[model samples]
Target: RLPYDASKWEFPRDRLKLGKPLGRGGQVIEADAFGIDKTATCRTVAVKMLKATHSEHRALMSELKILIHIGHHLNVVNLLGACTKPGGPLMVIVEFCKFGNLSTYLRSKRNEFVPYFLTLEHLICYSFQVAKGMEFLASRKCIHRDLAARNILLSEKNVVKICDFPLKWMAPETIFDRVYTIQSDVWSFGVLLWEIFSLGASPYPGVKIDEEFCRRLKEGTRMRAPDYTTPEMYQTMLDCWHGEPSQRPTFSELVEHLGNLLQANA
Candidate 1:
């Protein structure tokens, strides 16, 4: 394994070619970095290039370290590799999630006021997938500080892959009285539940971050659970967001509980 620096980066130009921009925030380059022969049809891969000074570069590297350490898991997003070209931008090569972020997908549905677009089955399955991914992270003593639908990738088969661990806050049991723990990921996952139920509506929608903070200070909470979420799931989310982090269920527990519900329904 090589440490990421502005060296040891090579772009296989003959293998990959630039394609249409995937989205506004990120640049998408098409290439056959999959190491397939040129005679093989090239696949379009999304390359997120971040300037060395960009906040994303730092955040991405922080998570990339953990992701690389954990390696590949089916429920977790795969990081093909990263590039650190000298005098150029830092690039992370990831599997192109064609369905895009769940956030954007939901917002599009909300704009059209289509209730059918929001499927309860999808929610349940996605929640299960996320829990499964978290279980893996917890097993390795890793924490994903930022867990949200925006970071979940959906496939045509309806499988969910956890991605974008940019804001990952790792636990240092040595430094603080209370160190970082996987329970924190559960807390964020609860917020993700709210987002899923609300069709990507902003958590505490219309409330400024400062206002939310003040509200939490006064009311003991900031974002209210969305109405559409079932009582069962809402209760689970509440357990995850307990004031005392230790009370939160481990991702393994979450998997077992949610798994039972899914199995029973099936």
Candidate 2:
């Protein structure tokens, strides 16, 4: 008596009020659901829809099963419900992270409402939490395949929730032979750390993904350090980008390393 059907997540449109795109590209959309509303007042949620061909539904269905199997965690974007009702597109309802993805949020640091510029301490805590989230994924035997700042959502409390074909964040082995492993994810995590400290700067500077970049990757040409990062933090990112997959940090190792950095700064 162990498994649950993915259909358990299905929702009906009557209770849902899907809204505008949460951000650019709009992979996830804003939504309001009535069932969980307090006394007819609607509670907001996120809706991920699959509106393309029948084949694409397979991908969303796979994602549904995967999210269901992993269950819930605070640092993860938990599924709230979904809509597979007849005569419409399939939708996945999930937790609405108010801060949106980490990349856009960090990039908005100069905006008027932000109380303070992100400090090293703030950055460390974010990396630590992200590492912990990835660790939890590893525990659940999940491979994110894509892990980067843009792929991660930021909660109202600024908690990092990991979530992306994501060419820019691909590990060397990933580009070389389409390999996907925890180590490959770890490699991307390193790139993500750089993306964070750089205040949402694009990875690899102006470098595009081409055979030359691949050659440079093979030749140990890694990215430069961010102006804001400490040496230790930059070195940790370097460890993540090691050409040898086995040389990369495990999620737990990353958790401990970033945790120690956080403790040091605290």
Candidate 3:
């Protein structure tokens, strides 16, 4: 029989040296691990720690299990290790994306090259890579209900990574009901597409994400095309947002489409 305990994979707390906070909040701690794996490569890591008293162990543990199941992919944030020892905070060590979340990273440009050096090729490449990663996750039968520019990460390279974990980007199925499916992720991917083509602009710009917004989304209304988004690219987003979940294109089709776009544009 297979081993019952995952403790063998549990990392020792003494080995991971915590470092400065990475992003918006101080809750997420970055670390430098020692003697646990390849030391040179483990220098920059992230710690997902449970703030002890506010215990939601079930959800955190579930996240750990899902990460364990999915393993690693070039376009997805890879899980590094875990620690659930007594008395210390529960931590899931994951690879840290040096460039930070996709949204912030993309926006950092307007403020860019000489001014706006980004090309359509970079945007298409990112969209293609996002599809490739999501295609892999979908093939694995894992549903990421939260798929958005904010939830995604960027490595030191132009690599786009799905991670961390959105409502403005939620699917109709997700908002109206709690049920999640790969199709729901497809819907969110559409919104992520909007964010990408729009250069990290907020979806439904100037519109508040309130109750009225929910009511409106229940109808067939959708976001308009971004200034830079090609006609076909916008259609891809529409196909993804098809009200009928079953009708939305699978990530595989998306990969193929974006792949062509990347090849043609790049």
Candidate 4:
């Protein structure tokens, strides 16, 4: 059964109270929200408001339809509710994560503490969590399309939840041919792992974001592993970045590999 049935989760516009903006980019704005139920109980949630053109609106609706059909998982962000009135802005409510996005969280911590303050165990744990999240999506036949550190959210307890879809971290085939699949997500996960080990360093450090970059990627040029990355971890990253999508391991394999790494180092 679907974890969230669209018919059952429609929220009334007037009952949703939007607060300060949590973040915004391109066509979406995320903000704090308070939902007053029929019982007058107030619930805090995160709201994603989308500014979609006619064509984009259809695409967004299709995506949301698929999302609502996928059952909930611990490592994945829960879609709490949604609102899609004819003339009003489209909004989706999700569980609020107090710590915010993972990329910013890691970068801020990097600046505040010594590099060694974050142990290998911490990195392994976070990576394992993300792998678990990806595994859930894979099992549901859902391709993340965009899997990156910036798209991941962190809770106050350090739990990692995968979210968002940005083209910047898309796979080579996806960028060149607009083909998205689970394999593309695996490639993006490789880049995300690099970001994690680099303490939130931007991918492809000096590479410009242009057609030339995509050309290089298609020619088998991959981002180098971060200095802190161990040989085993770097190898796994390379496996994920294999030029042939068919060569990349599935999320099931990734979760098992990462879990093994965690246990070995424990």
Candidate 5:
């Protein structure tokens, strides 16, 4: 039987290393693992080994529930399965995507890159796909509290997939519960657009995560607009980042806007 702990079952322990490390999460190293058959699958599987500790063990389980709930979507990462052994560590298996998180990709190229580095065509396609994903999640009542390029994965063919669900859930309202809501997601999505426009520039540019970001967010300061993007994109981002969450548009509205942009270009 498969162990309850995940780490012990991260890999089959039989397949040779076909390649170097593909990517890394804060707690896991993504790599190719052996399967039941002798034939090796190409770019189809990935192993997520959790950190060695009880604290992380609990965290992995929490993340597992989120992934399972989110399931498969064209713009969302797909979860395969998980392994949780008694004494060993935990592991969450998932599908392998070609380009890792967009954040890492952007950071590496930003220094020497130009504003037009990401073509308008690419941005429109990327934004539209993200809106589509959010549209689906909205209908299902899921709120991606943390939406950003760092959590968005891409295929070699430029297909987009949103990832990292532990930070996502079905919460609603920001009063006492501070729950997740469609509006909150809009805010996060705005930041995501900023990241895409800035080529993955770190949020808050010069501010520390705890000091500036959290403080500002708690006080209702929305993300500032980026100067490099087109007016249409900038306006959309601003609308989403409105201080009054109730004023934000629904995911359906977002889809409509993207649809218009698509038709206009067509």
Candidate 6:
């Protein structure tokens, strides 16, 4: 269970010692920090510092509320603590993923071109873990809104934890009509799968993110399968890209499909 009173979760600013920046989005900066865990153990943590601007305050609170409501899950990044006092910056402390975002990690491996560094088994396992995380979100009626390699973090042991919510990873309907649902997350999951199999290639490579691209997507254009993607994986990714949201497989279904693939290739 999560704390209902936001005050109960308020983390003291002085106790959170900020370190190097990890990443940033808009008015939010994610950084490494030294903090106490639930057990009072000193540990390295990922702290998201949000600017105290009015709009950012609302956005930070809304995201915190959703994260708290969803609670904890193995595949989803855990919200360890928060600082929500007035007249100061808002901060959210989460589990620190040492390997950082999956996108950057994969791309780095691809650049090195080291054989055995990224095998099909690794791809299957990673995708399966992400599917499991998305399944949990769907069960809680929480749409990730952004589900991509960049939003997924990897622990030192390569455990996948889904994080962040960005507009770029949203579904076509979300971009045009501003509608968000589990199906929309599924669309983004397809793109995430593409990123995984492509070794972190950008979604819709070379396509401009303008009305023309959205128009093409609405007209039924989808990203082509990257080279070396297995038929099963490619087909499953396509299932998530169906134009009609209702036609897309649910995350639960995706989990089973990806699980079977993982076992088959294990």
Maximum-lDDT candidate: 3
Give the per-residue lDDT digits (tens) of candidate 4, residues 50-94. 764778766666556666777688888887777876667787777
| Tens digits of per-residue lDDT for model 6, 83-175 | 777666778777878888898998888754422367888888889999999898878877777688988989867799998446447787888
> What's model 4's lDDT at 162?
88
Candidate 2 per-residue lDDT, tens place, 75-122, comes to: 788877777767877877788878877888888872422212677777
Q: Model 3 segments beyond 4 Å from truth?
A: 1-8, 23-26, 39-42, 111-116, 164-166, 208-216
- C-alpha lDDT of candidate 5 relative to the true structure: 0.66
For candidate 3, which ten residues in a row score worst on lDDT? 1-10
TM-score of each: 0.74, 0.85, 0.86, 0.80, 0.72, 0.84
lDDT of 1: 0.65
Q: Please list all clashing residue pairs in model 1, or write none if there are none.
A: none
Mark the regions of model 2 whose C-alpha exceeds 4 Å error after superposition. Answer: 1-12, 23-28, 37-41, 50-52, 85-89, 110-116, 164-167
Q: Which prediction has more favorable TM-score, 2 or 6? A: 2
lDDT, model 5, position 220: 66
- The 10-residue segment of model 1 with minimum total lDDT is 166-175
Give candidate 2's error at residue 152 in angstroms.
Answer: 1.0
| Candidate 5 Cα misplacement greater than 4 A, ranges | 1-26, 33-40, 51-55, 84-89, 107-117, 166-179, 203-225
lDDT measured at residue 181 in model 3 versus the true structure, 0 to 100? 93
Task: Work out candidate 6's RMSD over C-alphas.
Answer: 3.3
> Which consecutive 10 residues in model 4 have the weakest lDDT in total?
25-34
Per-model C-alpha lDDT, please? Answer: 0.65, 0.80, 0.81, 0.78, 0.66, 0.79
Error of 6 at 42 (Å): 2.3
Model 2 per-residue lDDT at 123: 81
TM-score-based ranking, best first? 3, 2, 6, 4, 1, 5
In terms of TM-score, the best-performing candidate is 3
Cα-based RMSD of the predictions, in order? Answer: 5.4, 3.4, 3.1, 3.9, 5.5, 3.3
